[PDB]
Design a protein around this ligand. Structure first.
Ligand SMILES: [Zn+2]
Ligand SMILES: [Zn+2]
Lengths: 254, 254
């Protein structure tokens, strides 16, 4: 399956993504985990040290490959065929999970970054449309890496939000952008829930059938989110709850 | 960890074992799954066809190896060193799970089977005491393959029973034999629960802290237990419940 996980906050949302990826390794022989959020470290939540994650060259820094896929001076290519060279664009964390880091885009400094952006786009296209393997791509609230073309291949867009007015609004906007792009299913995972009043707030603004699951706030999560990996470990209190969320996802996608 | 799963019934108990093994593959790089119950097919519940499971030569039929480990005519050896040749005594089901089948012992036909029994015993000893890898051994209510020596290496003995007087008695006897052998922890998994009255019966005869988990009887389990694998699949209704049982086990063992 092809999954997209989006939201603000950063680590919180990335924590859910890493959790699903790890659980997914039991059902798939290979998973492409794509870090498309420069503000959080997907590799870290997947068990690597922040250092090991950053030692993986990001897509944006593969100049030799970018030259080879878009042309060398003058020679322009708007549709780079990179689906065959994917394994050179990241590192296997283990026998099943292959991590790719997009890297951050240069917002806009009067310089030309067309070749770079074309290269990133071609990799995202390859992963979602050409590769058969499972893909989980972690991204920001703007989901700017998805296009109408790749959106048709997405099995589900998961918006991760916190139980408050502003975060709920963010999620509804994610849902708006995804629908506009043509994504078939959008579902929510509510994170950092502290009290029941907050759960009632969620139920008031969001359809319950659209809620994949609820993850309670963890005190051992604010003072321990960089040692014993994450919520996918069998010792973590969210372990079982996370598998329920995964089962609902699997059933939803078919 | 080193686990032993015992009970009557056969498939029911073997179903729990296979479930734990599959879930365990996420936490361990290699697991020795040992079918020590000739009445049920552990490999089948682990995803193989009954045919593929039976094409794996059982310990009892490795005459060449048995000769090489106990002597050849006259030459007797009561303590065969077979911990180094384990990978020749089974088949890898996949990249992590290695299946070994004990085969059935000749109850007693006036023939000498000392060499055979010594060989089986040496393999069980090697797995529990010498190998570092995780081991899950499925066995009958008599747990006759365990000895006081190997019992010291067992992290937990799991007795699987049904909610009725006779099955409860069976489990208490399993607990008796295990304690006598010196096994440190015995825990229960109650299977095929049909109603709440039965749950009350369990609570009446067994300490609740000793109960790892309860598995409801499945109607799609009586008419579907040889097609879509088992309870470890993400589409199975017992999926989440099984992970809760696994977490309690992990926490118990430490
Ligand atoms: Zn340009
Ligand atoms: Zn003899």
């Amino acid at each position: 399956m092809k999954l997209a996980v989006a939201g603000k906050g950063g680590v919180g949302k990335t924590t859910v993504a890493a959790g699903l990826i790890k659980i997914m390794a039991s059902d798939y022989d290979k998973i492409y985990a794509v870090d498309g959020d420069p503000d959080s470290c997907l590799g870290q939540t997947l068990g690597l040290s922040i250092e090991e994650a950053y030692a993986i060259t990001p897509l944006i820094e593969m100049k030799d490959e970018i030259r080879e896929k878009t042309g060398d001076g003058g020679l322009l290519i708007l549709n780079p065929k990179v689906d065959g060279d994917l394994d050179k664009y990241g590192r296997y964390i283990d026998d099943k999970i292959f991590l790719i880091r997009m890297g951050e885009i240069k917002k806009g400094g009067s310089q030309c970054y067309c070749r770079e952006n074309s290269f990133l786009g071609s990799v995202v296209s390859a992963l979602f449309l050409d590769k058969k393997e499972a893909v989980v791509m972690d991204m920001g609230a703007g989901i700017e890496h998805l296009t109408r073309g790749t959106a048709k291949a997405v099995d589900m867009m998961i918006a991760v939000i916190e139980p408050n007015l502003n975060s709920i609004k963010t999620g509804l906007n994610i849902e708006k952008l995804a629908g506009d792009l043509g994504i078939k299913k959008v579902r929510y995972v509510i994170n950092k829930v502290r009290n029941i009043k907050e759960e009632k707030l969620i139920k008031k603004h969001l359809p319950e059938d659209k809620i994949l699951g609820i993850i309670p706030y963890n005190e051992l999560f604010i003072e321990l989110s960089l040692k014993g990996e994450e919520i996918w470990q069998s010792t973590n209190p969210a372990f079982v709850n996370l598998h329920d969320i995964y089962q609902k996802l699997r059933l939803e996608v078919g």
